[PDB]
Amino acid sequence: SRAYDLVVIGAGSGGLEAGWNAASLHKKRVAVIDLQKHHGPPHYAALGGTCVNVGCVPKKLMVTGANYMDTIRESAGFGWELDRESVRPNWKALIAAKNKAVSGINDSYEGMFADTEGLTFHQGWGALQDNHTVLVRESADPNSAVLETLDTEYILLATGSWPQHLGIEGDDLCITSNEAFYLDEAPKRALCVGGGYISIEFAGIFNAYKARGGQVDLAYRGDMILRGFDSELRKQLTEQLRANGINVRTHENPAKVTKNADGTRHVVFESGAEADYDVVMLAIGRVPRSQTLQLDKAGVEVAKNGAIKVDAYSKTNVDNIYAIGDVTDRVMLTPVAINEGAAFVDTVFANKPRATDHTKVACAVFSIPPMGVCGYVEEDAAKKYDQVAVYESSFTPLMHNISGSTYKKFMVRIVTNHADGEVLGVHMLGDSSPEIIQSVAICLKMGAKISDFYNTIGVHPTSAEELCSMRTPAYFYQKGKRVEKI
Amino acid sequence: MSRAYDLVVIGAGSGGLEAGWNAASLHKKRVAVIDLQKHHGPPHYAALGGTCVNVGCVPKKLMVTGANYMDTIRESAGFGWELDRESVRPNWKALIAAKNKAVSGINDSYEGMFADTEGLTFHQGWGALQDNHTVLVRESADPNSAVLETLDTEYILLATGSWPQHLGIEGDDLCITSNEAFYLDEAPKRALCVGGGYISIEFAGIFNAYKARGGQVDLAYRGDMILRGFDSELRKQLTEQLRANGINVRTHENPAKVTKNADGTRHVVFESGAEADYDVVMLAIGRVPRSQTLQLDKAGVEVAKNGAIKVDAYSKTNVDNIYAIGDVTDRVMLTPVAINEGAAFVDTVFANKPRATDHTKVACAVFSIPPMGVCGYVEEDAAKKYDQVAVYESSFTPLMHNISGSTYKKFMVRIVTNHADGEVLGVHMLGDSSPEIIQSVAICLKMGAKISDFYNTIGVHPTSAEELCSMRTPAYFYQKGKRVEKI
Ligand SMILES: Cc1cc2nc3c(=O)[nH]c(=O)nc-3n(C[C@H](O)[C@H](O)[C@H](O)COP(=O)(O)OP(=O)(O)OC[C@H]3O[C@@H](n4cnc5c(N)ncnc54)[C@H](O)[C@H]3O)c2cc1C
Ligand SMILES: Cc1cc2nc3c(=O)[nH]c(=O)nc-3n(C[C@H](O)[C@H](O)[C@H](O)COP(=O)(O)OP(=O)(O)OC[C@H]3O[C@@H](n4cnc5c(N)ncnc54)[C@H](O)[C@H]3O)c2cc1C
Ligand SMILES: NC(=O)c1ccc[n+]([C@H]2O[C@@H](COP(=O)([O-])OP(=O)(O)OC[C@H]3O[C@@H](n4cnc5c(N)ncnc54)[C@H](OP(=O)(O)O)[C@@H]3O)[C@H](O)[C@H]2O)c1
Ligand SMILES: NC(=O)c1ccc[n+]([C@H]2O[C@@H](COP(=O)([O-])OP(=O)(O)OC[C@H]3O[C@@H](n4cnc5c(N)ncnc54)[C@H](OP(=O)(O)O)[C@@H]3O)[C@H](O)[C@H]2O)c1
């Protein structure tokens, strides 16, 4: 028997879920380790992990702020008069408010530890000495002071992921989203590099808060942003992004970043194009944060990219060490890590083997306008099924007639297995699609068919009723081939 | 002859237009649609597109969108937006002008549809029946007016909608109803909405945003609490949030006499003996089936005591070739329910695809500020129909509103279930976006979802809708009709 039942390394969405359920629902001695207790430099994350501190929660408060540049512009069309020249955004006030809010969640979690018997927080760098001994050192350097040594039954690794760096000359003058949450002034000219959702979301933020002559550029090495998402939506989002002032640059990737005399960055693009920017933000990928846990010391196998390898039940190759969340590089989303933490406590401390279903998980992109997506994209479904039907509706929501932002089309598209009518993926662009898609993913867990959609009576006037208005396929794929008739 | 027309539709509203257009376009019949007017406005208000396009859903939602801006411009200050907050002014004439050109564009679209659907024709005037195979198109509602046309038809479809109800009181002619509210040339300073339904609570939101600076909007309603028929908790939260935004909710209040002051404004004396004075007194206390000028006795069609045309599952009347759909039948009064009914009618009769419209678990949204999204049964009803009811409840302030300053804005979702098998019987939400969330929840409820279907879906974060998936434990129960607590 050991001093601790469970030692969780990482106090994030996964680790906090597993830690609280094991101590509370199962009366275990759980020790949770994290570097920091309040959000901020030097480690950015703290209690609550990347979601609370430098992820979902601060980013969404900041996208809600970014949104008012649009709604103040659009109130003109509904008769709201005001001195439009006085309208100035204020970055410092936004950052102060954000900071205020995340500090509350940090304090919420000291309360959780202080009120759960068996749950204790232990601040520092956790590293493995063998599969029953976790060390808490002062810093990642394996020659720093060990602050305490914990003897334990099971170990759960929930260390998350870290921004990926480009190895170009000048990478150290670029920032990543961690530092974007702590900037002092909003950049007048900014470069976001990557076409994934963290890039697009931050481009929407910077675009709203820049000084009046400013410009935001989004650079992407590929052909069209947001690879892996539905093509048509990717095409449509690129236009609304450009219609709000962003210079989307595809097939573009930086080569050298140099600091200019004033402190701005001089980028030389792989194309030979050059430009100067107040801030260059690297949002090119999040890599699994496993590289300093001394996993080698306990025999845990990691992947090429550093992902800790785990089976369906999150077990590694060492029988009492499990790993969950982003470090396992399965679907990197907060709900998915929370699920995995709950399954693990059932598997290990309740002996109810549970496995997280990583399929049909729905996700949103909080761009302006937003996206809400779930299940297959037609190219994939087309590969796995002989007859796929694709449905799509597109319309400007009426308020946008009167508002002036006529470039804002709501778009909804549905991919089905044409044989049985089962819905395989629903993809949406427009406001409120993050909210609409949550209820759509429930339908998709239950095996909804397309007649289940169009036999439901609509709620009018709403965009979401278009989901129940599509009864005829726009086109098909018969045996991998796009086709118009079957 | 043969019979000159296949179907004559009286009423070019939601269900009428659905039927007339599907029957001619898809089944090639010769269809005559009758309406009083081609473009919105006085004197009839409703025109092509009916009540919803001209004086109902579409104008009301645009004016609700405008009304919202009072709160979004207020709330931007918490997120660092700086502006001359003194200079903010609503301008009602600009709202009505924009609204009016958005509605007239839709009237032009319908016009084009008659122009290019071969077989479909608009006929204009008052439609009345002569016998079950002859519709008269008269000059006006008067049974004596000149009859401009006589249509010899096989089928008659009655899709005439409903109309505002009036109080019997002295002064009733000084009050307006929602038809005129869409046409006010000046937003009222002080205004009273009487009624506790969705139209009333909706116009209190609109007048409250556009009033001049010291204005007041009062909503009077004779019951104990507004929006009878909805979730009890949600009616308490909506009343407090209405109040928190400046609307004075006077319950157990009903006008007794309205009189005109010298200055123009109206003086209302409540039955309580309370009295006040207002620019506008709007009455939103009920909608009557509009069937009285039709001469249904000539064809022998039976109507309910409130004017509702009595119909069966297939919308057929007691006269076999006459059918009725939409609000004139008084089943569920909503545009999507009339549309479904219209399409089911053309399948049954012309496509030999018999379809009764299902009127259970129809979702509906109340576009108040904040809005509500509702589908299925309220717990007090479920408790009378099932021996074991569990209520799951969750309410939270979006952290958005900690920063925004509107801390009164609680989001709330309440789920009612049959506790034996855990099927979800009703989902009821209050809060922003709830009308977009409930549509997709109505699909789950028609499939027969159980609450394990909800809490085993992985959430999308950060959203309000993800509370639907984070409810695992019942708050209290109803065992054999009594609110129990451990079951
Ligand atoms: C900018 C951005 C936006 C995002 N937005 C969304 C969104 O809106 N929705 C969504 O669902 N997902 C979003 N994500 C992702 C989401 O934050 C992650 O999926 C999720 O937090 C990962 O969960 P986790 O349990 O693996 O731990 P994480 O939440 O990353 O937590 C990891 C924890 O381990 C700690 N740590 C690291 N190594 C050690 C060590 N040796 N000792 C001790 N502690 C250590 C980190 O300090 C710590 O906080 C976003 C991510 C980013 C970066
Ligand atoms: C203020 C308001 C807001 C509403 N908001 C919503 C909402 O957001 N969502 C929703 O689902 N529902 C809403 N409704 C209800 C919805 O508008 C109606 O349920 C729907 O339009 C009814 O469809 P209908 O086919 O019965 O006829 P209607 O659309 O009312 O059409 C009736 C048609 O018949 C014509 N007519 C009547 N008598 C004759 C005659 N003798 N000859 C010729 N023509 C005649 C009327 O002029 C004509 O427009 C609202 C209604 C109002 C009043
Ligand atoms: N919508 C969702 O919520 C969702 C979606 C997907 C993933 N995830 C998850 O995955 C994480 C990382 O997100 P991310 O936004 O950083 O996106 P990611 O999609 O890998 O973003 C990388 C982007 O940069 C490009 N890129 C990658 N490596 C590059 C390189 N070396 N040089 C140049 N460009 C390069 C990629 O182009 P290519 O696309 O051509 O590689 C892609 O456009 C999230 O934190 C995690 O939550 C969530
Ligand atoms: N949420 C929705 O979308 C919703 C809800 C229900 C129905 N509907 C649909 O069906 C309809 C009828 O619903 P409604 O809400 O308008 O119905 P209603 O109850 O007739 O609405 C009238 C409102 O005024 C009150 N009232 C009625 N007669 C009164 C009188 N003579 N004296 C004083 N006040 C009186 C009613 O109170 P009491 O309740 O005390 O009578 C209620 O508060 C609508 O036309 C229709 O579009 C929609």
Residue A423 corresponds to which amino acid? V
CB contacts of B454 in chain A (<8 Å) are 442
Q: Is A51 within 8 Å of chain B by CB? A: yes
Beta bridge pairs of residue B324: B158
- The answer to whether the beta carbons of residues A11 and A23 sit under 8 Å apart is no
Respond yes or no: is residue A460 known to be catalytic: yes
Residue A390 corresponds to which amino acid? V
User: Dihedral, CA atoms, A343, A345, A348, A351, nearest 10 degrees?
Assistant: -70
Q: Can you read off the two tokens belonging to residue B98? A: 């924009």
Under CATH, which number does the domain A360-486 receive? 3.30.390.30
The span from the CA of B469 to the CA of B399, in Å, is 19
- The answer to whether the beta carbons of residues A355 and A313 sit under 8 Å apart is yes
- The answer to whether the beta carbons of residues B101 and B117 sit under 8 Å apart is no
**Whose C-alpha lies nearest to ligand 4, atom 47?**
B333
- In terms of Cβ atoms closer than 10 Å to its own Cβ (0-12, 13-18, 19+), residue B215 is middle
Least Cα distance to B372 among B237, B240, B206, B249 occurs for B237
* CA end-to-end distance (rounded Å), chain A: 66
CB distance B436–A436 less than 8 Å? yes
Expt. technique? X-ray
Provide CB contacts within 8 A for B248, sequence distance 6+: B216, B217, B218, B219
Q: Is A337 within 8 Å of chain B by CB? A: no
Minimal CA separation from A418 to chain B, in Å: 20
Residue A303 corresponds to which amino acid? A
Q: Can you read off the two tokens belonging to residue B67? A: 């009304």
Q: Tokens 């709604």: give the residue.
A: A71
CA B72, B78, B83, B85 dihedral sign is: positive
Residue B200 corresponds to which amino acid? S
CB distance A438–B93 less than 8 Å? no
- The answer to whether the beta carbons of residues B358 and A444 sit under 8 Å apart is no
Q: Which atom of ligand 3 is nearest to the CA of A200?
A: 15
Residue B127 in marked binding region: no
Report domain B361-487's class.
alpha beta
CB contacts of B334 in chain A (<8 Å) are 457, 460
Provide CB contacts within 8 A for A236, sequence distance 6+: A409, A411, A429
Q: Can you read off the two tokens belonging to residue A430? A: 């427009």
Q: Which CATH number among 3.40.50.10860, 3.30.200.190, 3.40.718.10, 3.50.50.60 corresponds to the domain B165-285?
A: 3.50.50.60
The span from the CA of A340 to the CA of A24, in Å, is 17
Q: What is the H or E stretch that residue A68 is in?
A: helix A56-75
Q: Which ligand is nearest to the CA of A178?
A: 1
Provide CB contacts within 8 A for A354, sequence distance 6+: A313, A342, A343, A346, A347
DSSP structure class, residue A422: B
DSSP structure class, residue A486: -
CA A329 to ligand 1 center in whole angstroms: 12
Phi-psi region of B49 (alpha: psi -120 to 50; beta: other; left: phi over 0): left
Q: Is A469 within 8 Å of chain B by CB? A: no
Domain boundaries, chain A: 1-163+285-359, 164-284, 360-486
Helix axes B198-210, B232-244, angle to 10 degrees: 20
Q: Which chain A residues in 355-414 lie under 8 Å from chain B, judged by CB atoms?
A: 357, 361-364, 372, 398-399, 401-402
Considering the domain B1-164+286-360, what is its CATH architecture? 3-Layer(bba) Sandwich (3.50)
Q: What resolution in angstroms, rounded to 1 decimal?
A: 2.8
- Cα angle at B385 between B383 and B391, to 5 degrees? 35
Which residue among A68, A401, A462 sits closest to B439, beta carbon to beta carbon? A462
Q: Is A436 within 8 Å of chain B by CB? A: yes
Q: Is A395 helix (H, G, I), strand (E, B) or coil?
A: strand
CA A335 to ligand 3 center in whole angstroms: 18
- Domain pair A164-284 / A360-486, same fold: no
- Which residue of A100, A432, A455, A460 is the best one to mutate when testing the B interface, meaning the one whose CB has the most B CBs within 10 A? A460
- The answer to whether the beta carbons of residues B196 and B227 sit under 8 Å apart is yes
Provide CB contacts within 8 A for A306, sequence distance 6+: A287, A288, A289, A290, A291
Cα→Cα distances B401→A71, B78, B397, B405, B410, Å: 17, 9, 7, 6, 9
CB distance A90–B80 less than 8 Å? yes
The span from the CA of B269 to the CA of A279, in Å, is 66
CB distance A446–B441 less than 8 Å? no
Q: Can you read off the two tokens belonging to residue B485? A: 């607590």
CB contacts of A65 in chain B (<8 Å) are 76, 79-81
CATH 3.50.50.60 fits A1-163+285-359, yes or no: yes
Which residue among A81, A452, A468 sits closest to B447, beta carbon to beta carbon? A452
CB distance B79–A57 less than 8 Å? no
Q: Which atom of ligand 4 is nearest to the CA of B254?
A: 33
Q: Is B98 within 8 Å of chain A by CB? A: yes
Q: Can you read off the two tokens belonging to residue A157? A: 């690794």
Residue B290 CA, chain-centre distance (Å), reads: 16
CB distance B400–A61 less than 8 Å? yes
> Searching chain A, which residue's CA lies closest to the CA of residue B444?
A443
- Which residue of B71, B81, B369, B432 is the best one to mutate when testing the A interface, meaning the one whose CB has the most A CBs within 10 A? B81
Residue B399 CA, chain-centre distance (Å), reads: 31
- In terms of Cβ atoms closer than 10 Å to its own Cβ (0-12, 13-18, 19+), residue B221 is buried
CA B339 to ligand 2 center in whole angstroms: 11
CB distance B446–A455 less than 8 Å? yes
Candidate list B133, B401, B419, B461, residue with the active-site label? B461
Q: Can you read off the two tokens belonging to residue B390? A: 């569990």
Report domain A164-284's class.
alpha beta
Candidate list A26, A132, A251, A460, residue with the active-site label? A460
Backbone angles phi and psi of A341, in degrees to 5: -75, -45
The span from the CA of A360 to the CA of B288, in Å, is 47
